[PDB]
Design a protein around this ligand. Structure first.
Ligand SMILES: CCNC(=O)N1CCNC(=O)[C@H]1CC(=O)OC
Length: 291
């Protein structure tokens, strides 16, 4: 799977909000482009003069994520974050010249991402009460990954002493994205666990935080809630469900070729962090079938 790389695999079956620190600093921002940020401004102007209803929006930038020594007390993860925008994304990661910006970042800063917006995405492995994960079909008419399978999520917009509010907005945003797209009541959702961070190499290395969320509704109830919004209540064109039993071997299925990179990230991290048992009981052959 060359189009997805794991930046972080969380310990302990995934980290709760209270174990994560953020450092939001202008030291974590994109570097100005070698010939100047006028190249970004020019692409944006061209785009607005075709689609003048488009708007800019602020985004969090991922710089890096450092895990504590395993088994330690205290904060277990430090997220280093800066600020970027939708405009900066369109002029760097989405640019035809994105590979040239990665090579120049390696040369100038020893960092393939130094000249990339790299907005932080969020996504969920969302499990039902009857042990299915939730999948969404993307419209064939959008610009990014048309017609591909996704999981719930999005790209959160901003608003450890500003740090804790930023971690709160990241955990909040994955629940809000589930309520907005799947049409589930907030009180049917567990507090999220962070499983890890995956990078999309087809989008020049931009990263998504992948979470596990449990729903108290069955697959049939989740489907009713999604459909009862009507076609205007969701950006996706359909919903479907795969038994957690079968998610284990999803990379061997014909579905795998249809998953967008960030959804592949969520499923690899679900299988390594919530699946893959370590103890004698769940590891026994009748509960963990060989091959
Ligand atoms: C639905 C919320 N719109 C949104 O988040 N955008 C990203 C920021 N600006 C935009 O103009 C749109 C572009 C887009 O793809 O929306 C159709």
């Amino acid at each position: 799977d060359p189009e997805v790389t794991l930046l972080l695999q969380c310990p302990g079956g995934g980290l709760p909000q209270e174990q994560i620190q953020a450092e939001l600093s202008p030291a974590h921002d994109r570097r100005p482009l070698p010939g100047g940020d006028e190249a970004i401004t020019a692409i944006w102007e061209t785009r607005l003069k075709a689609q003048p209803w488009l708007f800019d929006a602020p985004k969090f930038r991922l710089h890096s994520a450092t895990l504590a020594p395993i088994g330690s007390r205290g904060p277990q993860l430090l997220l280093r974050l800066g600020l970027t925008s939708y405009r900066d994304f369109l002029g760097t990661n989405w640019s035809s010249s994105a590979a040239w910006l990665r090579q120049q970042g390696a040369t100038d800063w020893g960092d393939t991402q130094a000249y990339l917006a790299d907005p932080l995405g969020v996504g969920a492995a969302l499990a039902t009460a009857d042990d299915f994960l939730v999948f969404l079909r993307r419209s064939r008419q959008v610009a990014e990954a048309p017609g591909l399978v996704d999981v719930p999520g999005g790209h959160p917009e901003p608003q450890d002493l500003a740090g804790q509010l930023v971690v709160h907005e990241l955990f909040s945003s994955v629940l809000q994205e589930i309520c907005d797209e799947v049409n589930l009541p907030l009180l049917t959702l567990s507090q999220p666990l962070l499983l890890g961070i995956a990078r999309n190499e087809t989008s020049a290395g931009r990263a998504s935080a992948e979470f596990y969320v449990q729903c108290s509704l069955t697959s049939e109830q989740v489907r009713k809630h999604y459909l009862s919004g009507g076609p205007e209540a969701h950006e996706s064109t359909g919903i479907f469900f795969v038994e957690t039993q079968n998610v284990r071997r999803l990379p061997e299925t014909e579905m795998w070729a249809e998953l967008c990179p960030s959804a592949k990230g969520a499923i690899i991290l679900y299988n390594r962090v919530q699946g893959s048992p370590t103890g004698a009981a769940l590891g026994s052959p009748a509960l963990l079938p060989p091959l």
